[PDB]
Design a protein around this ligand. Structure first.
Ligand SMILES: OC[C@@H]1C=CCCN1c1ncnc2[nH]ccc12
Ligand SMILES: [Cl-]
Length: 167
């Protein structure tokens, strides 16, 4: 039993809700919140910009030190950093950005990072400003993640389409 509330159950381990991931994380304080990161951990917009703003830019400060030490992430890769005031940890995961021409096949590799954590609050990877089809992103999530994932979908219209079209 966990403290996530109001989710629809898609499979044994995947749940979905219309919610603002920032507001969700502040309420639940999950062990892990997933960020829709880029390889440079430059949290300018989309989910990443919103999560970083909610940390008063502390996420960006920590991320800049991470990059200065380790260099960029790989597309499909991840790193674990602090969750600041939002969660214990933030799993920064880089899905392919279709608007940069990155290979959508890497979306499965991106979701595989979730399997290293027993429970996560997450967005759909490569959705929104990353330019992938969110219906596809949900399909890959369900077919790749085996741990317990609570998916927050900000847009109410998109959420209804995701549910009504889910196979
Ligand atoms: O697929 C990512 C998704 C789709 C469109 C825009 C960003 N996205 C978000 N998903 C969940 N919570 C969010 N809070 C702020 C943004 C946000
Ligand atoms: Cl985004």
């Amino acid at each position: 039993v966990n403290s996530f509330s109001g989710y629809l159950k898609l499979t044994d381990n995947v749940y979905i809700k219309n919610a603002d991931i920032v507001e969700e994380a502040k309420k639940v304080k999950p062990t892990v919140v997933v960020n829709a990161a880029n390889v440079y951990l430059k949290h300018g917009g989309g989910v990443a910009g919103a999560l970083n703003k909610a940390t008063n830019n502390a996420m960006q400060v920590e991320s800049d030190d991470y990059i200065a030490t380790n260099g960029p992430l790989k597309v499909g890769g991840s790193c674990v950093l602090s969750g600041h005031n939002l969660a214990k940890h933030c799993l920064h995961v880089v899905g392919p950005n279709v608007n940069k021409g990155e290979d959508i096949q890497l979306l499965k590799s991106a979701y595989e990072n979730f399997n290293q954590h027993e429970v996560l609050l997450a967005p759909l990877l490569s959705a929104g400003i990353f330019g992938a089809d969110p219906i596809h992103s949900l399909r890959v999530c369900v077919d790749t993640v085996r741990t317990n994932v609570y998916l927050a979908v900000f847009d109410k219209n998109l959420y209804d389409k995701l549910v009504s079209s889910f196979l």
